[PDB]
Design a protein around this ligand. Structure first.
Ligand SMILES: Nc1nc2c(ncn2[C@@H]2O[C@H](COP(=O)(O)OP(=O)(O)NP(=O)(O)O)[C@@H](O)[C@H]2O)c(=O)[nH]1
Ligand SMILES: [Mg+2]
Lengths: 166, 15
């Protein structure tokens, strides 16, 4: 079994928790409910453990959680496609990942969540342009319908494998 | 906004 330490980041309310809980517990939280989650899965023939750290902008101090962050192997950079501010804020998160990891080359996937919503304000081309500037994949997801959810996390696993031997 | 430190993703408001 190969373990992948994945960290989900992004601005308030973009669906970080909803994506993680959909992936791991197969449940969509329509409540706004402001942890760590694990699931064993087979990815490209490899028995894999997805070890997900679900972050937030308001959390109680925890030295161990800071240790979890620094050892994260790949990051999902989440914005919501109906939240232009969350898209604008991606650049802050990308820079902060590099600080937390003390590294210029960290596996990352850009995720545009809430793709089920018709009130879109971030065009796919905008998000593609941003991802291209960063040299990372862009994937649209809906934690609600599950569209793209496995693809986003499995793409991050594949980005980690491109970066380092697992 | 920004981040309060360089260890995690806790934010601060610039407003
Ligand atoms: N329609 C729709 N709503 C979603 C989706 N993902 C999350 N939501 C909704 O958006 C709200 C915030 O979701 P949540 O997972 O708590 O986001 P978060 O990024 O973890 N918030 P926080 O930064 O406070 O931890 C909730 O009402 C949730 O149901 C999605 O794909 N589609
Ligand atoms: Mg959350």
């Amino acid at each position: 079994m190969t373990e992948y330490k994945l960290v989900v980041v992004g601005a308030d309310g973009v669906g970080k928790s909803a994506l993680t809980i959909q992936l791991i517990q197969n449940h969509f939280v329509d409540e706004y409910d402001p942890d760590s989650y694990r699931k064993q899965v087979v990815i490209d023939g490899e028995t894999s453990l997805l070890d997900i750290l679900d972050t937030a902008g308001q959390e109680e101090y925890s030295a161990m959680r800071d240790q979890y962050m620094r050892t994260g192997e790949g990051f999902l950079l989440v914005f919501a496609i109906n939240n232009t501010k969350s898209f604008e804020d991606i650049h802050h998160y990308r820079e902060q990942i590099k600080r937390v990891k003390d590294s210029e080359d960290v596996p990352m996937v850009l995720v545009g969540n809430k793709s089920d919503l018709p009130s879109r304000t971030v065009d796919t081309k905008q998000a593609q342009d941003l991802a291209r500037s960063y040299g990372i994949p862009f994937i649209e997801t809906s934690a609600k319908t599950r569209q793209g959810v496995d693809d986003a996390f499995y793409t991050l696993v594949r980005e980690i494998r491109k970066h380092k031997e697992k | 906004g920004x981040f309060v430190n360089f260890r995690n993703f806790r934010t601060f408001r610039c407003g």
